[PDB]
Design a protein around this ligand. Structure first.
Ligand SMILES: C[S@@+](CC[C@H](N)C(=O)[O-])C[C@H]1O[C@@H](n2cnc3c(N)ncnc32)[C@H](O)[C@@H]1O
Ligand SMILES: C[S@@+](CC[C@H](N)C(=O)[O-])C[C@H]1O[C@@H](n2cnc3c(N)ncnc32)[C@H](O)[C@@H]1O
Lengths: 219, 219
Protein backbone atom coordinates (compact mmCIF):
# COMPACT_ATOMS: atom_id res chain seq x y z
CA UNK A 1 0.00 0.00 0.00
CA UNK A 2 1.26 3.49 -1.01
CA UNK A 3 0.39 4.69 2.55
CA UNK A 4 3.08 2.49 4.28
CA UNK A 5 5.62 3.57 1.66
CA UNK A 6 4.67 7.31 1.82
CA UNK A 7 4.74 7.28 5.69
CA UNK A 8 8.27 5.64 5.59
CA UNK A 9 9.51 8.51 3.27
CA UNK A 10 7.91 11.00 5.76
CA UNK A 11 9.69 9.37 8.80
CA UNK A 12 13.13 9.18 7.09
CA UNK A 13 12.90 12.89 5.92
CA UNK A 14 12.57 13.84 9.67
CA UNK A 15 14.58 11.12 11.47
CA UNK A 16 16.28 8.77 8.92
CA UNK A 17 18.93 11.05 7.35
CA UNK A 18 21.48 8.95 5.43
CA UNK A 19 24.97 10.54 5.20
CA UNK A 20 27.59 9.83 2.44
CA UNK A 21 29.15 6.70 4.08
CA UNK A 22 25.56 5.15 4.26
CA UNK A 23 24.67 6.21 0.62
CA UNK A 24 28.04 4.66 -0.47
CA UNK A 25 27.32 1.37 1.40
CA UNK A 26 23.96 1.09 -0.50
CA UNK A 27 25.70 1.80 -3.91
CA UNK A 28 28.62 -0.67 -3.16
CA UNK A 29 25.96 -3.47 -3.57
CA UNK A 30 25.21 -2.82 -7.30
CA UNK A 31 28.98 -2.21 -7.94
CA UNK A 32 30.00 -5.60 -6.30
CA UNK A 33 26.77 -7.30 -7.56
CA UNK A 34 25.56 -8.14 -3.99
CA UNK A 35 21.83 -8.55 -3.19
CA UNK A 36 19.90 -5.41 -1.99
CA UNK A 37 18.85 -7.10 1.34
CA UNK A 38 20.12 -4.48 3.88
CA UNK A 39 17.99 -2.88 6.67
CA UNK A 40 16.19 0.38 5.64
CA UNK A 41 17.40 3.78 6.99
CA UNK A 42 14.47 3.83 9.55
CA UNK A 43 15.36 0.28 10.78
CA UNK A 44 18.99 1.54 10.81
CA UNK A 45 18.01 4.38 13.11
CA UNK A 46 15.89 2.00 15.27
CA UNK A 47 18.94 -0.31 15.76
CA UNK A 48 21.00 2.78 16.77
CA UNK A 49 18.48 3.82 19.53
CA UNK A 50 18.25 0.27 20.95
CA UNK A 51 22.10 0.17 21.07
CA UNK A 52 22.08 3.52 23.01
CA UNK A 53 19.31 2.03 25.31
CA UNK A 54 21.65 -0.99 26.16
CA UNK A 55 24.44 1.60 26.79
CA UNK A 56 26.38 -0.50 24.22
CA UNK A 57 30.23 -0.60 24.44
CA UNK A 58 30.26 -4.13 22.87
CA UNK A 59 27.96 -5.22 19.94
CA UNK A 60 27.80 -8.60 18.13
CA UNK A 61 26.37 -8.74 14.56
CA UNK A 62 25.73 -11.91 12.48
CA UNK A 63 25.60 -10.91 8.78
CA UNK A 64 27.62 -7.84 7.65
CA UNK A 65 26.79 -7.66 3.87
CA UNK A 66 28.12 -4.18 2.76
CA UNK A 67 28.03 -3.06 6.45
CA UNK A 68 24.97 -0.72 6.16
CA UNK A 69 23.51 -1.92 9.55
CA UNK A 70 27.09 -1.99 10.95
CA UNK A 71 27.58 1.81 10.28
CA UNK A 72 24.21 2.74 12.04
CA UNK A 73 24.95 0.59 15.15
CA UNK A 74 28.72 1.41 15.40
CA UNK A 75 27.75 5.16 15.46
CA UNK A 76 25.87 4.50 18.78
CA UNK A 77 29.25 3.38 20.37
CA UNK A 78 31.37 5.84 22.42
CA UNK A 79 35.08 6.44 21.36
CA UNK A 80 36.28 3.25 23.19
CA UNK A 81 33.40 1.02 21.93
CA UNK A 82 33.67 -2.18 19.83
CA UNK A 83 31.45 -3.91 17.21
CA UNK A 84 32.36 -7.43 16.02
CA UNK A 85 30.39 -8.40 12.84
CA UNK A 86 30.52 -11.97 11.29
CA UNK A 87 30.36 -12.59 7.46
CA UNK A 88 30.65 -15.97 5.60
CA UNK A 89 31.33 -14.23 2.25
CA UNK A 90 34.86 -12.79 1.75
CA UNK A 91 33.62 -10.57 -1.14
CA UNK A 92 30.99 -9.18 1.33
CA UNK A 93 33.65 -8.70 4.10
CA UNK A 94 36.09 -6.83 1.71
CA UNK A 95 33.32 -4.44 0.50
CA UNK A 96 32.13 -3.95 4.17
CA UNK A 97 35.78 -3.09 5.05
CA UNK A 98 35.95 -0.28 2.38
CA UNK A 99 32.52 1.03 3.57
CA UNK A 100 33.56 0.98 7.28
CA UNK A 101 36.88 2.78 6.42
CA UNK A 102 35.02 5.46 4.34
CA UNK A 103 32.93 6.03 7.57
CA UNK A 104 35.98 6.51 9.89
CA UNK A 105 34.83 3.43 11.90
CA UNK A 106 38.05 1.39 11.22
CA UNK A 107 39.14 1.50 14.94
CA UNK A 108 35.65 0.57 16.38
CA UNK A 109 34.57 -2.22 13.93
CA UNK A 110 36.19 -5.68 13.47
CA UNK A 111 34.93 -8.00 10.62
CA UNK A 112 35.59 -11.78 11.19
CA UNK A 113 35.22 -13.84 7.91
CA UNK A 114 33.86 -17.44 8.30
CA UNK A 115 30.66 -19.33 9.31
CA UNK A 116 28.92 -17.80 12.38
CA UNK A 117 28.54 -21.33 13.97
CA UNK A 118 32.44 -21.63 13.95
CA UNK A 119 33.34 -18.01 14.99
CA UNK A 120 30.82 -18.02 17.94
CA UNK A 121 32.79 -20.69 19.93
CA UNK A 122 36.03 -18.73 19.17
CA UNK A 123 34.37 -15.68 20.82
CA UNK A 124 33.50 -17.82 23.94
CA UNK A 125 37.07 -19.32 24.15
CA UNK A 126 38.78 -15.88 23.66
CA UNK A 127 36.31 -14.31 26.20
CA UNK A 128 35.16 -11.45 23.86
CA UNK A 129 31.79 -11.41 25.74
CA UNK A 130 29.62 -10.20 27.25
CA UNK A 131 27.93 -8.14 24.45
CA UNK A 132 25.49 -5.32 25.34
CA UNK A 133 23.49 -5.91 22.13
CA UNK A 134 23.51 -8.80 19.56
CA UNK A 135 22.01 -8.42 16.04
CA UNK A 136 21.23 -11.76 14.24
CA UNK A 137 20.62 -11.23 10.45
CA UNK A 138 22.32 -14.23 8.67
CA UNK A 139 20.96 -17.53 7.14
CA UNK A 140 17.64 -18.37 8.91
CA UNK A 141 17.65 -22.20 9.39
CA UNK A 142 20.23 -22.06 12.29
CA UNK A 143 18.49 -19.07 14.05
CA UNK A 144 17.68 -21.35 17.11
CA UNK A 145 21.42 -22.24 17.44
CA UNK A 146 22.76 -18.67 16.85
CA UNK A 147 20.45 -17.56 19.75
CA UNK A 148 21.85 -20.28 22.16
CA UNK A 149 25.38 -18.99 21.36
CA UNK A 150 23.95 -15.42 21.72
CA UNK A 151 22.85 -16.31 25.34
CA UNK A 152 26.25 -17.90 26.01
CA UNK A 153 27.76 -14.40 25.08
CA UNK A 154 25.16 -12.26 27.01
CA UNK A 155 24.95 -10.54 30.43
CA UNK A 156 21.73 -9.92 32.41
CA UNK A 157 19.95 -7.13 30.42
CA UNK A 158 21.61 -7.89 26.97
CA UNK A 159 19.20 -7.05 24.08
CA UNK A 160 19.17 -9.79 21.37
CA UNK A 161 17.64 -8.79 18.00
CA UNK A 162 16.66 -11.26 15.23
CA UNK A 163 15.40 -9.84 11.92
CA UNK A 164 12.96 -11.26 9.24
CA UNK A 165 11.22 -13.89 11.49
CA UNK A 166 7.67 -13.20 10.02
CA UNK A 167 8.60 -13.48 6.28
CA UNK A 168 5.56 -11.74 4.67
CA UNK A 169 3.39 -13.75 7.16
CA UNK A 170 4.44 -17.06 5.52
CA UNK A 171 5.28 -18.30 9.11
CA UNK A 172 1.44 -18.81 9.38
CA UNK A 173 1.80 -21.74 6.87
CA UNK A 174 2.67 -24.83 9.05
CA UNK A 175 2.94 -26.71 5.69
CA UNK A 176 5.57 -24.38 4.05
CA UNK A 177 8.78 -26.32 3.03
CA UNK A 178 10.97 -23.18 2.49
CA UNK A 179 14.05 -23.66 4.76
CA UNK A 180 13.81 -19.92 5.82
CA UNK A 181 10.05 -20.10 6.81
CA UNK A 182 10.82 -23.36 8.76
CA UNK A 183 13.88 -21.72 10.43
CA UNK A 184 11.77 -18.68 11.54
CA UNK A 185 8.88 -20.98 12.75
CA UNK A 186 11.37 -23.04 14.88
CA UNK A 187 12.91 -19.81 16.25
CA UNK A 188 9.49 -18.20 17.06
CA UNK A 189 8.32 -21.38 18.95
CA UNK A 190 11.74 -21.48 20.77
CA UNK A 191 11.42 -17.76 21.84
CA UNK A 192 7.85 -18.47 23.03
CA UNK A 193 9.18 -21.35 25.24
CA UNK A 194 12.48 -19.67 26.43
CA UNK A 195 12.63 -18.75 30.19
CA UNK A 196 16.11 -17.08 29.97
CA UNK A 197 14.56 -14.07 28.05
CA UNK A 198 11.46 -11.83 27.89
CA UNK A 199 10.61 -11.19 24.24
CA UNK A 200 8.16 -9.96 21.61
CA UNK A 201 8.12 -9.72 17.77
CA UNK A 202 7.53 -6.33 16.02
CA UNK A 203 5.59 -6.24 12.72
CA UNK A 204 7.37 -3.68 10.45
CA UNK A 205 6.08 -1.94 7.26
CA UNK A 206 7.66 0.62 4.93
CA UNK A 207 9.47 0.52 1.54
CA UNK A 208 11.12 -2.84 2.52
CA UNK A 209 8.58 -5.75 2.30
CA UNK A 210 6.45 -6.73 5.38
CA UNK A 211 9.14 -7.71 7.92
CA UNK A 212 9.21 -9.03 11.51
CA UNK A 213 11.89 -8.20 14.10
CA UNK A 214 12.33 -10.29 17.33
CA UNK A 215 13.45 -8.42 20.51
CA UNK A 216 14.59 -10.47 23.56
CA UNK A 217 16.24 -9.19 26.81
CA UNK A 218 18.30 -11.61 29.00
CA UNK A 219 16.98 -12.00 32.65
CA UNK B 1 -5.42 -6.97 5.64
CA UNK B 2 -6.23 -10.17 7.59
CA UNK B 3 -2.49 -11.14 7.30
CA UNK B 4 -1.63 -8.49 10.02
CA UNK B 5 -4.50 -9.67 12.34
CA UNK B 6 -3.40 -13.37 11.96
CA UNK B 7 0.32 -12.48 12.47
CA UNK B 8 -0.62 -10.44 15.61
CA UNK B 9 -2.57 -13.50 16.94
CA UNK B 10 0.50 -15.74 16.12
CA UNK B 11 2.82 -13.37 18.05
CA UNK B 12 0.45 -12.95 21.11
CA UNK B 13 -0.09 -16.79 21.26
CA UNK B 14 3.71 -17.16 21.65
CA UNK B 15 4.72 -13.95 23.51
CA UNK B 16 1.61 -11.82 24.40
CA UNK B 17 -0.05 -13.81 27.22
CA UNK B 18 -2.58 -11.73 29.26
CA UNK B 19 -3.40 -12.73 32.89
CA UNK B 20 -6.63 -12.02 34.91
CA UNK B 21 -5.58 -8.38 35.75
CA UNK B 22 -5.11 -7.51 32.00
CA UNK B 23 -8.32 -9.19 30.69
CA UNK B 24 -10.19 -7.61 33.70
CA UNK B 25 -8.71 -4.19 32.74
CA UNK B 26 -9.94 -4.81 29.10
CA UNK B 27 -13.48 -5.82 30.26
CA UNK B 28 -13.63 -2.86 32.76
CA UNK B 29 -13.99 -0.78 29.52
CA UNK B 30 -17.48 -2.25 28.77
CA UNK B 31 -18.54 -2.17 32.52
CA UNK B 32 -17.68 1.63 32.81
CA UNK B 33 -18.61 2.48 29.15
CA UNK B 34 -15.19 3.93 28.05
CA UNK B 35 -13.73 3.72 24.49
CA UNK B 36 -11.94 0.63 22.95
CA UNK B 37 -8.45 2.30 22.72
CA UNK B 38 -5.58 0.96 24.94
CA UNK B 39 -2.49 -0.77 23.41
CA UNK B 40 -2.68 -4.37 22.02
CA UNK B 41 -1.21 -7.20 24.16
CA UNK B 42 1.83 -7.16 21.78
CA UNK B 43 2.35 -3.37 22.24
CA UNK B 44 1.89 -4.05 26.00
CA UNK B 45 4.75 -6.58 25.90
CA UNK B 46 6.92 -4.24 23.74
CA UNK B 47 6.46 -1.38 26.36
CA UNK B 48 7.32 -3.84 29.23
CA UNK B 49 10.60 -4.81 27.42
CA UNK B 50 11.45 -1.08 26.83
CA UNK B 51 10.94 -0.41 30.57
CA UNK B 52 13.45 -3.25 31.45
CA UNK B 53 16.01 -1.96 28.84
CA UNK B 54 15.70 1.46 30.69
CA UNK B 55 16.20 -0.47 34.02
CA UNK B 56 13.03 1.39 35.09
CA UNK B 57 12.43 2.05 38.86
CA UNK B 58 10.30 5.23 38.19
CA UNK B 59 7.94 5.42 35.15
CA UNK B 60 5.64 8.30 34.08
CA UNK B 61 2.51 7.71 31.88
CA UNK B 62 0.02 10.22 30.27
CA UNK B 63 -3.50 8.85 29.63
CA UNK B 64 -4.42 6.02 32.07
CA UNK B 65 -7.83 5.03 30.58
CA UNK B 66 -8.37 1.60 32.34
CA UNK B 67 -4.66 0.94 33.27
CA UNK B 68 -4.03 -1.83 30.62
CA UNK B 69 -0.74 -0.17 29.47
CA UNK B 70 -0.06 0.77 33.15
CA UNK B 71 -0.22 -2.90 34.40
CA UNK B 72 2.14 -4.09 31.53
CA UNK B 73 4.84 -1.48 32.29
CA UNK B 74 4.21 -1.67 36.11
CA UNK B 75 5.18 -5.40 35.91
CA UNK B 76 8.65 -4.37 34.57
CA UNK B 77 9.36 -2.59 37.93
CA UNK B 78 11.17 -4.05 40.96
CA UNK B 79 9.20 -4.37 44.27
CA UNK B 80 10.88 -1.00 45.12
CA UNK B 81 9.73 0.78 41.89
CA UNK B 82 7.05 3.47 41.24
CA UNK B 83 4.75 4.43 38.30
CA UNK B 84 2.74 7.72 38.22
CA UNK B 85 -0.08 7.93 35.58
CA UNK B 86 -2.15 11.08 34.75
CA UNK B 87 -5.85 10.79 33.74
CA UNK B 88 -8.16 13.70 32.69
CA UNK B 89 -11.50 11.98 33.37
CA UNK B 90 -12.43 11.04 37.02
CA UNK B 91 -14.44 7.93 35.93
CA UNK B 92 -11.37 6.50 34.03
CA UNK B 93 -9.04 7.22 37.05
CA UNK B 94 -11.43 5.47 39.57
CA UNK B 95 -11.85 2.38 37.25
CA UNK B 96 -8.02 2.27 36.74
CA UNK B 97 -7.53 2.22 40.59
CA UNK B 98 -9.77 -0.96 40.81
CA UNK B 99 -8.00 -2.86 37.92
CA UNK B 100 -4.59 -1.79 39.35
CA UNK B 101 -5.58 -2.73 42.97
CA UNK B 102 -6.75 -6.13 41.52
CA UNK B 103 -3.24 -6.59 39.90
CA UNK B 104 -1.64 -6.00 43.38
CA UNK B 105 0.15 -2.83 42.10
CA UNK B 106 -1.58 -0.48 44.66
CA UNK B 107 1.76 0.60 46.33
CA UNK B 108 3.86 0.72 43.07
CA UNK B 109 1.44 2.95 40.98
CA UNK B 110 -0.06 6.38 41.91
CA UNK B 111 -3.01 7.60 39.71
CA UNK B 112 -3.60 11.43 39.58
CA UNK B 113 -6.87 12.94 38.20
CA UNK B 114 -6.26 16.24 36.28
CA UNK B 115 -5.23 17.78 32.92
CA UNK B 116 -1.65 16.57 32.15
CA UNK B 117 -0.67 20.26 31.34
CA UNK B 118 -1.32 21.10 35.12
CA UNK B 119 0.09 17.96 36.85
CA UNK B 120 3.35 17.78 34.81
CA UNK B 121 4.47 21.10 36.43
CA UNK B 122 3.37 19.92 39.96
CA UNK B 123 5.68 16.84 39.35
CA UNK B 124 8.65 19.11 38.37
CA UNK B 125 7.76 21.26 41.47
CA UNK B 126 7.48 18.14 43.79
CA UNK B 127 10.84 16.79 42.43
CA UNK B 128 9.19 13.45 41.31
CA UNK B 129 11.83 13.30 38.49
CA UNK B 130 13.90 12.00 36.91
CA UNK B 131 11.92 9.16 35.16
CA UNK B 132 13.52 6.06 33.51
CA UNK B 133 10.72 5.93 30.88
CA UNK B 134 7.82 8.27 29.95
CA UNK B 135 4.78 6.94 27.99
CA UNK B 136 2.71 9.73 26.29
CA UNK B 137 -0.76 8.61 25.08
CA UNK B 138 -3.22 11.48 25.86
CA UNK B 139 -4.76 14.30 23.68
CA UNK B 140 -2.69 14.81 20.45
CA UNK B 141 -2.74 18.67 20.13
CA UNK B 142 -0.58 19.30 23.28
CA UNK B 143 2.00 16.56 22.31
CA UNK B 144 4.95 19.08 21.79
CA UNK B 145 4.04 20.69 25.20
CA UNK B 146 3.95 17.23 26.92
CA UNK B 147 7.37 16.42 25.34
CA UNK B 148 9.09 19.66 26.60
CA UNK B 149 7.78 18.82 30.15
CA UNK B 150 8.96 15.18 29.70
CA UNK B 151 12.52 16.52 28.94
CA UNK B 152 12.33 18.45 32.30
CA UNK B 153 11.29 15.14 34.04
CA UNK B 154 14.17 13.17 32.34
CA UNK B 155 17.80 12.11 32.95
CA UNK B 156 20.34 11.22 30.20
CA UNK B 157 19.27 7.88 28.60
CA UNK B 158 15.53 8.36 29.46
CA UNK B 159 13.18 6.69 26.93
CA UNK B 160 10.22 8.95 25.93
CA UNK B 161 7.51 7.02 23.96
CA UNK B 162 4.72 9.01 22.18
CA UNK B 163 1.99 6.75 20.70
CA UNK B 164 -0.40 7.46 17.73
CA UNK B 165 1.78 10.12 16.00
CA UNK B 166 0.83 8.80 12.45
CA UNK B 167 -3.05 8.79 12.74
CA UNK B 168 -3.66 6.08 10.05
CA UNK B 169 -1.36 8.10 7.68
CA UNK B 170 -3.34 11.42 7.75
CA UNK B 171 -0.10 13.19 8.93
CA UNK B 172 0.71 13.16 5.13
CA UNK B 173 -2.21 15.68 4.77
CA UNK B 174 -0.69 19.18 5.47
CA UNK B 175 -4.22 20.57 4.62
CA UNK B 176 -5.86 18.44 7.38
CA UNK B 177 -8.06 20.72 9.55
CA UNK B 178 -8.18 17.96 12.27
CA UNK B 179 -6.56 19.13 15.55
CA UNK B 180 -5.15 15.60 16.38
CA UNK B 181 -3.58 15.36 12.88
CA UNK B 182 -2.08 18.92 13.06
CA UNK B 183 -0.96 18.14 16.68
CA UNK B 184 0.82 14.92 15.53
CA UNK B 185 2.39 16.69 12.50
CA UNK B 186 3.78 19.49 14.78
CA UNK B 187 5.14 16.90 17.28
CA UNK B 188 6.76 14.94 14.35
CA UNK B 189 8.46 18.11 12.89
CA UNK B 190 9.59 18.93 16.50
CA UNK B 191 11.25 15.45 16.94
CA UNK B 192 12.67 16.12 13.48
CA UNK B 193 14.43 19.30 14.78
CA UNK B 194 15.18 18.39 18.46
CA UNK B 195 18.94 18.09 19.28
CA UNK B 196 18.15 17.04 22.91
CA UNK B 197 17.19 13.45 21.64
CA UNK B 198 17.74 10.75 18.97
CA UNK B 199 14.34 9.44 17.78
CA UNK B 200 12.50 7.32 15.21
CA UNK B 201 8.85 6.54 14.46
CA UNK B 202 7.86 2.82 14.21
CA UNK B 203 4.97 1.94 11.86
CA UNK B 204 2.76 -0.55 13.79
CA UNK B 205 0.10 -2.95 12.37
CA UNK B 206 -2.00 -5.78 13.87
CA UNK B 207 -5.45 -5.98 15.60
CA UNK B 208 -5.52 -2.21 16.47
CA UNK B 209 -5.86 0.42 13.68
CA UNK B 210 -2.56 1.19 11.76
CA UNK B 211 -0.68 3.67 14.04
CA UNK B 212 2.87 4.95 14.66
CA UNK B 213 4.92 5.10 17.90
CA UNK B 214 7.69 7.69 18.45
CA UNK B 215 10.84 6.60 20.39
CA UNK B 216 13.31 9.20 21.73
CA UNK B 217 16.30 8.63 24.02
CA UNK B 218 17.43 11.79 25.94
CA UNK B 219 21.21 12.30 25.24
C1 LIG C 1 20.62 -9.75 5.39
S1 LIG C 1 22.30 -9.67 4.77
C2 LIG C 1 23.08 -8.71 6.10
C3 LIG C 1 22.70 -7.22 5.88
C4 LIG C 1 23.07 -6.27 7.02
N1 LIG C 1 22.43 -6.71 8.29
C5 LIG C 1 22.59 -4.84 6.68
O1 LIG C 1 21.44 -4.54 7.03
O2 LIG C 1 23.38 -4.08 6.10
C6 LIG C 1 22.84 -11.38 5.02
C7 LIG C 1 24.33 -11.60 5.11
O3 LIG C 1 24.57 -12.79 5.90
C8 LIG C 1 25.67 -13.45 5.35
N2 LIG C 1 25.63 -14.84 5.79
C9 LIG C 1 24.79 -15.81 5.32
N3 LIG C 1 24.95 -16.97 5.92
C10 LIG C 1 25.94 -16.73 6.86
C11 LIG C 1 26.54 -17.57 7.82
N4 LIG C 1 26.22 -18.85 7.96
N5 LIG C 1 27.47 -17.02 8.64
C12 LIG C 1 27.77 -15.72 8.48
N6 LIG C 1 27.29 -14.85 7.59
C13 LIG C 1 26.36 -15.42 6.81
C14 LIG C 1 25.51 -13.27 3.85
O4 LIG C 1 26.76 -13.49 3.25
C15 LIG C 1 25.06 -11.81 3.78
O5 LIG C 1 26.18 -10.94 3.72
C1 LIG D 1 -5.42 6.36 24.37
S1 LIG D 1 -6.24 6.44 25.95
C2 LIG D 1 -4.91 5.86 27.05
C3 LIG D 1 -4.92 4.32 27.08
C4 LIG D 1 -3.59 3.67 27.48
N1 LIG D 1 -2.61 3.77 26.37
C5 LIG D 1 -3.83 2.19 27.85
O1 LIG D 1 -3.47 1.31 27.06
O2 LIG D 1 -4.34 1.97 28.95
C6 LIG D 1 -6.36 8.26 26.19
C7 LIG D 1 -6.61 8.74 27.61
O3 LIG D 1 -6.09 10.08 27.75
C8 LIG D 1 -6.97 10.81 28.56
N2 LIG D 1 -6.74 12.24 28.37
C9 LIG D 1 -7.22 13.05 27.37
N3 LIG D 1 -6.86 14.30 27.49
C10 LIG D 1 -6.09 14.32 28.64
C11 LIG D 1 -5.44 15.36 29.31
N4 LIG D 1 -5.45 16.62 28.89
N5 LIG D 1 -4.77 15.05 30.45
C12 LIG D 1 -4.77 13.78 30.87
N6 LIG D 1 -5.35 12.72 30.33
C13 LIG D 1 -6.01 13.06 29.19
C14 LIG D 1 -8.35 10.32 28.13
O4 LIG D 1 -9.35 10.60 29.08
C15 LIG D 1 -8.08 8.82 28.04
O5 LIG D 1 -8.24 8.16 29.29
Amino acid sequence: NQIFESVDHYISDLLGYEDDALLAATNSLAEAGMPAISVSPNQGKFLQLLAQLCQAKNILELGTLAGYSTIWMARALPKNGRLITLEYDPKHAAVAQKNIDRAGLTSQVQIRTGKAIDILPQLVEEGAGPFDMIFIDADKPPYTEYFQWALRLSRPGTLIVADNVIRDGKVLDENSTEPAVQGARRFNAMLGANTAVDATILQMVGVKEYDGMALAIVK
